Design a protein around this motif. Structure first.
Motif, PDB file in Angstrom:
ATOM      1  N   UNK A   1       0.637  -1.143   0.036  1.00  0.00           N
ATOM      2  CA  UNK A   1      -0.014  -0.058  -0.004  1.00  0.00           C
ATOM      3  C   UNK A   1       0.862   1.274   0.043  1.00  0.00           C
ATOM      4  N   UNK A   2       0.568   2.256  -0.942  1.00  0.00           N
ATOM      5  CA  UNK A   2       0.997   3.744  -0.960  1.00  0.00           C
ATOM      6  C   UNK A   2       0.808   4.249   0.427  1.00  0.00           C
ATOM      7  N   UNK A   3       2.010   4.902   0.836  1.00  0.00           N
ATOM      8  CA  UNK A   3       2.093   5.415   2.297  1.00  0.00           C
ATOM      9  C   UNK A   3       2.501   6.805   2.107  1.00  0.00           C
ATOM     10  N   UNK A   4       2.076   8.083   2.288  1.00  0.00           N
ATOM     11  CA  UNK A   4       2.447   9.139   2.334  1.00  0.00           C
ATOM     12  C   UNK A   4       3.487   9.623   3.148  1.00  0.00           C
ATOM     13  N   UNK A   5       3.456   8.909   4.506  1.00  0.00           N
ATOM     14  CA  UNK A   5       4.334   9.245   5.411  1.00  0.00           C
ATOM     15  C   UNK A   5       5.826   8.656   5.172  1.00  0.00           C
ATOM     16  N   UNK A   6       5.845   7.789   4.151  1.00  0.00           N
ATOM     17  CA  UNK A   6       7.324   7.505   3.768  1.00  0.00           C
ATOM     18  C   UNK A   6       8.023   8.414   3.118  1.00  0.00           C
ATOM     19  N   UNK A   7       7.392   9.463   2.630  1.00  0.00           N
ATOM     20  CA  UNK A   7       8.129  10.604   1.977  1.00  0.00           C
ATOM     21  C   UNK A   7       8.319  12.016   2.832  1.00  0.00           C
ATOM     22  N   UNK A   8       8.151  11.808   4.236  1.00  0.00           N
ATOM     23  CA  UNK A   8       8.335  12.979   5.021  1.00  0.00           C
ATOM     24  C   UNK A   8       9.493  13.588   4.831  1.00  0.00           C
ATOM     25  N   UNK A   9      10.635  13.108   4.566  1.00  0.00           N
ATOM     26  CA  UNK A   9      12.083  13.468   4.478  1.00  0.00           C
ATOM     27  C   UNK A   9      12.187  14.399   3.273  1.00  0.00           C
ATOM     28  N   UNK A  10      11.304  14.223   2.182  1.00  0.00           N
ATOM     29  CA  UNK A  10      11.450  14.499   0.665  1.00  0.00           C
ATOM     30  C   UNK A  10      10.355  15.378   0.198  1.00  0.00           C
ATOM     31  N   UNK A  11      10.407  16.070  -0.789  1.00  0.00           N
ATOM     32  CA  UNK A  11       9.306  16.653  -1.402  1.00  0.00           C
ATOM     33  C   UNK A  11       9.006  16.024  -2.671  1.00  0.00           C
ATOM     34  N   UNK A  12       7.818  16.213  -3.336  1.00  0.00           N
ATOM     35  CA  UNK A  12       7.504  15.989  -4.541  1.00  0.00           C
ATOM     36  C   UNK A  12       8.504  16.469  -5.822  1.00  0.00           C
ATOM     37  N   UNK A  13       9.106  15.939  -6.747  1.00  0.00           N
ATOM     38  CA  UNK A  13       9.915  16.199  -7.807  1.00  0.00           C
ATOM     39  C   UNK A  13       9.024  16.939  -8.899  1.00  0.00           C
ATOM     40  N   UNK A  14       9.356  18.311  -9.098  1.00  0.00           N
ATOM     41  CA  UNK A  14       8.487  18.929 -10.128  1.00  0.00           C
ATOM     42  C   UNK A  14       9.101  18.591 -11.511  1.00  0.00           C
ATOM     43  N   UNK A  15       7.879  18.515 -12.379  1.00  0.00           N
ATOM     44  CA  UNK A  15       8.242  18.547 -13.857  1.00  0.00           C
ATOM     45  C   UNK A  15       9.543  19.449 -14.558  1.00  0.00           C
ATOM     46  N   UNK A  16      10.400  18.877 -15.128  1.00  0.00           N
ATOM     47  CA  UNK A  16      11.416  19.698 -15.830  1.00  0.00           C
ATOM     48  C   UNK A  16      11.833  19.023 -16.903  1.00  0.00           C
ATOM     49  N   UNK A  17      12.491  19.520 -17.974  1.00  0.00           N
ATOM     50  CA  UNK A  17      13.299  19.070 -19.000  1.00  0.00           C
ATOM     51  C   UNK A  17      14.622  19.681 -19.128  1.00  0.00           C
ATOM     52  N   UNK A  18      15.648  18.630 -18.882  1.00  0.00           N
ATOM     53  CA  UNK A  18      16.885  19.122 -19.164  1.00  0.00           C
ATOM     54  C   UNK A  18      17.730  18.612 -20.365  1.00  0.00           C
ATOM     55  N   UNK A  19      18.605  19.466 -20.949  1.00  0.00           N
ATOM     56  CA  UNK A  19      19.231  18.766 -22.105  1.00  0.00           C
ATOM     57  C   UNK A  19      20.780  19.890 -22.399  1.00  0.00           C
ATOM     58  N   UNK A  20      21.671  19.175 -22.374  1.00  0.00           N
ATOM     59  CA  UNK A  20      22.883  19.722 -22.731  1.00  0.00           C
ATOM     60  C   UNK A  20      23.259  19.462 -24.277  1.00  0.00           C
ATOM     61  N   UNK A  21      22.265  18.783 -25.286  1.00  0.00           N
ATOM     62  CA  UNK A  21      22.771  18.401 -26.471  1.00  0.00           C
ATOM     63  C   UNK A  21      22.905  19.578 -27.317  1.00  0.00           C
ATOM     64  N   UNK A  22      23.446  19.566 -28.371  1.00  0.00           N
ATOM     65  CA  UNK A  22      23.631  20.922 -28.991  1.00  0.00           C
ATOM     66  C   UNK A  22      22.196  21.237 -29.849  1.00  0.00           C
ATOM     67  N   UNK A  23      22.126  22.399 -30.258  1.00  0.00           N
ATOM     68  CA  UNK A  23      20.684  22.798 -30.583  1.00  0.00           C
ATOM     69  C   UNK A  23      21.119  22.477 -32.156  1.00  0.00           C
ATOM     70  N   UNK A  24      20.501  21.644 -32.779  1.00  0.00           N
ATOM     71  CA  UNK A  24      20.717  21.229 -34.254  1.00  0.00           C
ATOM     72  C   UNK A  24      19.340  20.332 -34.660  1.00  0.00           C
ATOM     73  N   UNK A  25      18.347  20.691 -35.400  1.00  0.00           N
ATOM     74  CA  UNK A  25      17.156  20.027 -36.073  1.00  0.00           C
ATOM     75  C   UNK A  25      17.413  18.503 -36.623  1.00  0.00           C
ATOM     76  N   UNK A  26      18.261  18.420 -37.608  1.00  0.00           N
ATOM     77  CA  UNK A  26      18.556  17.045 -38.155  1.00  0.00           C
ATOM     78  C   UNK A  26      17.069  16.428 -38.543  1.00  0.00           C
ATOM     79  N   UNK A  27      16.970  16.190 -39.988  1.00  0.00           N
ATOM     80  CA  UNK A  27      16.008  15.175 -40.462  1.00  0.00           C
ATOM     81  C   UNK A  27      14.887  16.161 -41.213  1.00  0.00           C
TER      82      UNK A  27
END
Ligand code: LNS
Ligand code: ZN
Ligand code: ZN
Ligand code: ZN
Length: 459
Positions: A371-397
């Motif tokens: 069973x899912x239990x919210x108290x397991x996460x008391x030392x943490x926070x919800x991870x917010x959405x984000x997109x990260x990328x270090x790839x070069x800016x280039x369309x291709x195709x």
């Protein structure tokens, strides 16, 4: 040895209160005959109405707990209860319906099973704690015969209509009145001491006993899930693809690589403790970090105690760096954690009701999850959405509308305008992320996690 032999012995002690005088020596062949069914020595894909425990496990998506209680035997009304929570009263003349004749009751049974099962399985497996009335009521809503196909499609037939004399699968059965070629299993044949409630309550406190037939039906299926997926685990049984399995699995791998890579970049941990699947691979292979693995199989009963996983004397210092718990269910995560935890409350075709608040998640393999239990996460926070990328800016195709987003962490967005490639990758990543969340997965992270620290990785 693939099917259950009709000449196998069936223990009748559980049946003798409803059926007094029942012979102690009994086979499935004689039991099926006593239920009013005739098998005619037929080699047409249906050798026995009853199935083995191994066959039941392979068809867990088809499980429907079924119980019948005497309201007052062809003279008295019967309460038909199903693990869907439905109670129907059939007169011989938690949803509770008033007494109706079998000709209408059978139409409701076919509608209920078809709606519950059309996206889960090609069949129904009635899970019983057989006492007699449920077996003798089957002739009033069940028809048997050779294996057949649907009149409108290629799927195997699960329903029969007396109005049209035709057969249908769960998807095409509107207006059908008989369940056709169902399967069943009597849990009472597995060797238990005492009644249903005493055995169910040893392992589960979430299902009570209001004394109605649907409560017993729910407990029966719950006990069967506990025996087959909690105390006994088989990760060799493969289950068919019935939904978004492949997309969900690919999405989970994408999100894991994204989140772990960004946490390592943002906080520069010298060591990562990867706790879980003994077959896990480094999800960020190019990362500089000291990657250390700790083996823990998926817990199917209660969540792991962090004191057992970490203590009893490894880097030993789990407090150094970051801990990665990717689907490794623990009672209380440490504060320095990156966590993926399946939410058992989620409604989906992949997630079946389980034992003691847990759920049975079936995606390629069956995984009973505590069973899912919210108290397991008391030392943490919800991870917010984000997109990260270090790839070069280039369309291709693939058409374009310029992307504007505070959560697209790229060189182009830092420079003031998201390039086409990173907008395409961002939209693909957002789709994978939403797929994973909607499937039931939840993401949690150490409180110091801040995406603002990712912008200086572009210099
Ligand atoms: C052989 N067919 C199956 O195992 C199955 C399972 C779930 C859904 C469906 C369907 O919707 O057709 N079919
Ligand atoms: Zn069909
Ligand atoms: Zn239960
Ligand atoms: Zn770019």
């Amino acid at each position: 040895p693939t099917h259950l032999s009709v000449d196998t012995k069936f223990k009748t002690e559980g049946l003798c209160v409803d059926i007094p005088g029942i012979p102690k020596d009994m086979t499935y062949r004689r039991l099926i005959s006593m239920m009013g069914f005739k098998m005619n020595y037929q080699v047409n894909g249906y050798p026995n109405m009853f199935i083995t425990r191994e066959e039941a496990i392979r068809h867990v998506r088809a499980w429907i707990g079924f119980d019948v209680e005497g309201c007052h035997g062809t003279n008295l009304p019967l309460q038909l209860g199903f693990s869907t929570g439905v109670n129907l009263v059939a007169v011989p003349t938690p949803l509770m319906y008033k007494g109706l004749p079998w000709n209408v009751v059978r139409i409701k049974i076919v509608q209920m099973l078809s709606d519950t099962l059309k996206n889960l399985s090609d069949r129904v497996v009635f899970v019983l704690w057989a006492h007699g009335f449920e077996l003798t009521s089957m002739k009033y809503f069940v028809k048997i015969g050779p294996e057949r196909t649907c009149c409108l499609c290629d799927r195997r037939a699960t329903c029969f209509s007396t109005a049209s004399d035709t057969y249908a699968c769960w998807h095409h059965s509107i207006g059908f009145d008989y369940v056709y070629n169902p399967f069943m299993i009597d849990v009472q044949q597995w060797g238990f001491t005492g009644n249903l409630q005493s055995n169910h309550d040893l392992y589960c406190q979430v299902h009570g006993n209001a004394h109605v037939a649907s409560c017993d039906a729910i407990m029966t299926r719950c006990l069967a899930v506990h025996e087959c997926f909690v105390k006994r685990v088989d990760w060799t049984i493969e289950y068919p693809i019935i939904g978004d399995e492949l997309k969900i699995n690919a999405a989970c791998r994408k999100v894991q690589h994204m989140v772990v890579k960004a946490a390592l970049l943002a906080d520069k941990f010298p060591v990562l403790h990867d706790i879980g699947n003994p077959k896990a691979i480094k999800c960020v292979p190019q990362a500089d970090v000291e990657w250390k693995f700790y083996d823990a199989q998926p817990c199917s009963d209660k969540a792991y105690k962090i004191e057992e996983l970490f203590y009893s004397y490894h880097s030993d210092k789990f407090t150094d760096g970051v801990c990665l718990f990717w689907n490794c269910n623990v009672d209380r995560y440490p504060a320095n954690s990156i966590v993926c935890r399946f939410d058992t409350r989620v409604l989906s075709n992949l997630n079946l009701p389980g034992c003691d608040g847990g759920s049975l998640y079936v995606n390629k393999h069956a995984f009973h999850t505590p069973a899912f239990d919210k108290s397991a996460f008391v030392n943490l926070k919800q991870l917010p959405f984000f997109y990260y990328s270090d790839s070069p800016c280039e369309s291709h195709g693939i058409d374009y509308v310029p992307l504007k987003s505070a959560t697209c962490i790229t060189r182009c967005n830092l420079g003031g305008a998201v390039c086409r490639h990173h907008a395409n990758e961002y939209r693909l990543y957002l789709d994978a992320y939403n797929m994973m969340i909607s499937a039931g997965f939840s993401l949690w992270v150490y409180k110091q996690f801040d995406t603002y620290n990712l912008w200086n990785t572009f210099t």
